[PDB]
């Protein structure tokens, strides 16, 4: 099946610093990864799709990277409003191979 190993579960970083989140897929997903932002008591907010493309209206300090099995999410120039739980998800659909899963999440 498809699973997503997202590290780390939680992380601390000062305002103005950079934080790195990583997502690992059990199978190759060919750059078909998304990144979401979720604040407590709120619906998720789309951040990045296709591992690199930034969603409209999302600050450029959120930077996604990766291909295949390994992907990273980097948040530079950290702000107070950035504190939230961050998830990744695979929407891989070659046509014959189905890979869909959510990351465990990073606080």
């Amino acid at each position: 099946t498809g699973v997503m190993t997202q590290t780390p579960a939680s992380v601390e970083a000062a305002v103005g610093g950079t934080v790195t989140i990583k997502c690992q897929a059990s199978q190759n997903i060919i750059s078909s990864l998304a990144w979401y932002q979720q604040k407590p008591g709120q619906r998720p907010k789309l951040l990045i799709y296709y591992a690199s493309t930034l969603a409209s209206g999302v600050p450029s300090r959120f930077k996604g990277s990766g291909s295949g099995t390994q992907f990273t999410l980097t948040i530079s120039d950290l702000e107070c409003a950035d504190a939230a739980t961050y998830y990744c998800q695979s929407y891989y659909y070659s046509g014959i191979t189905y890979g869909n899963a959510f990351g465990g999440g990073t606080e």
């Binding site: 060919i30 750059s31 078909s32 929407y91 659909y93 070659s94 046509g95 014959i96």
Partner: protein, 451 residues
């Protein structure tokens, strides 16, 4: 090669000697396998796929399942017993097969021999599904490098993903569905119900390549085939492929390409005769005689040239296309010109002269023959069928509006003076042949009733 066809008498009845070609037949095939993915990778444009890919998968499964079952009929009933000195091959379950031709059974044996490398290739099944390029090379231990061709993958990568920004998602989805449907429409002619016996290595690689849009050049060059007779093998339908595995879950197939080498058939040539209309009894005629004669070990036989590739140097065939010849035709080619039939010429356009060994053979009654050297016309009497024009008669002849210089004829010095016996007239039209047969039955029956 020598002469056993009595070409002089044949020339007098309008059959001019043509080019002598070699006889080459395919043999010793070189086997290479290749994977063909019938479903493109749409991961980079998955948002606009909709349900198109599911419908396409259903249709492609409907197409592919009969091929898999036909192959399984032999795969399930072919057993590889533990090898030893008593048996050197595998056994075919004749009762289980039930009814099969010799070629089909040999193709089943070939399918078994393919099964080994087919199993080796299928170890990379997860990698095959992950491929997103039109042509890709798979390496894992530098052993039997697997090549994978994917259908429509180049269209997905160069025409739909680049324009995904520019056009709406529904437009992109419709374009994808149209591409898949056109691929199915073109692929159906080869892989549909027309493909009755998938257990056969007789299908040409050009037909096999329809799964890859008919780009057999890419398929062949990817596997690394290279030979001087690449084009000669291709055009003579000698390069063939065989489906050796079908995956209904992943929608890909493995084909085994049979690449042979041309071998010159020793002590064999193929002589061609150029038909020319000759005049007899104030009428024009054409000898109804094999234009291509196969001679092998000085044995005259007919040949089914239509299935062969004719080049200037040789005749290339994917099998022996020799056919028997009746004794009367062989006696006429032997030199009994009264045995070759002829047919009336009523068409305004028919070959009325030819050129062999620098010597002309012209119907100077139908055409206007003039001698450019002497400046006087070349006339042909009614008693003679053809006219031989050479250096003794005319150094530079003029046939219509062509001016050709001639050589010297090497036959009888009195060719135009000797003459020969004309054969019988015939009618080659189909309904005419039926009419002739029926009138013959009536004449024979009247004679028998008189008896």
């Amino acid at each position: 090669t020598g002469g056993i066809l009595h070409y002089e008498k044949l020339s007098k009845i309008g059959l001019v000697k043509g080019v002598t070609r070699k006889y080459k037949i395919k043999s010793n095939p070189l086997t290479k396998d290749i994977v063909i993915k019938m479903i493109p990778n749409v991961s980079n444009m998955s948002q606009c796929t909709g349900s198109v890919m599911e419908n396409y998968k259903t249709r492609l499964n409907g197409i592919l399942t009969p091929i898999k079952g036909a192959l399984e009929i032999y795969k399930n009933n072919t057993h590889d017993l533990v090898g030893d000195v008593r048996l050197a091959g595998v056994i075919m379950a004749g009762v289980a097969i039930g009814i099969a031709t010799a070629a089909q059974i040999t193709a089943g044996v070939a399918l078994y021999e393919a099964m080994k490398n087919a199993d080796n290739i299928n170890k990379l099944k997860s990698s095959i599904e992950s491929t997103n390029e039109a042509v890709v090379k798979l390496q894992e231990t530098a052993e039997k490098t697997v090549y994978v061709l994917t259908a429509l993958q180049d269209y997905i990568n160069t025409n739909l993903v680049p324009t995904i920004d520019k056009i709406s998602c529904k437009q992109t989805e419709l374009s994808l569905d149209l591409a898949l449907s056109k691929y199915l429409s073109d692929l159906l002619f080869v892989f549909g119900p027309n493909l009755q016996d998938p257990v056969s290595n007789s299908m040409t690689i050009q037909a096999i390549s329809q799964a890859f849009g008919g780009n057999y050049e890419t398929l062949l060059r990817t596997l690394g085939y290279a030979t001087e007779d690449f084009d000669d093998l291709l055009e003579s339908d000698s390069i063939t492929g065989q489906i050796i595995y079908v995956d209904l879950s992943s929608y890909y197939i493995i084909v085994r390409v049979y690449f042979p080498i041309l071998t010159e058939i020793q002590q064999a040539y193929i002589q061609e005769l150029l038909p020319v209309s000759f005049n007899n009894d104030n009428s024009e005629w054409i000898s109804i005689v094999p234009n291509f004669i196969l001679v092998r070990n000085t044995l005259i036989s007919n040949i089914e040239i239509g299935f062969c590739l004719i080049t200037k140097r040789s005749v290339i065939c994917n099998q022996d296309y020799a056919t028997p010849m009746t004794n009367n035709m062989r006696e006429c080619l032997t030199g009994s010109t009264e045995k070759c039939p002829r047919e009336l010429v009523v068409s305004s356009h028919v070959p009325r002269f030819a050129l062999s060994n620098g010597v002309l053979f012209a119907n100077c009654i139908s055409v206007t023959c003039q001698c450019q050297t002497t400046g006087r016309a070349i006339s042909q009497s009614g008693e003679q069928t053809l006219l031989m024009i050479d250096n003794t008669t005319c150094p530079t002849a003029v046939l219509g509006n062509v001016i050709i210089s001639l050589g010297k004829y090497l036959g009888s010095v009195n060719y135009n003076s000797e003459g020969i016996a004309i054969g019988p007239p015939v009618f080659t039209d189909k309904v005419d042949i039926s009419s002739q047969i029926s009138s013959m039955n009536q004449s024979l029956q009247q004679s028998k009733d008189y008896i």
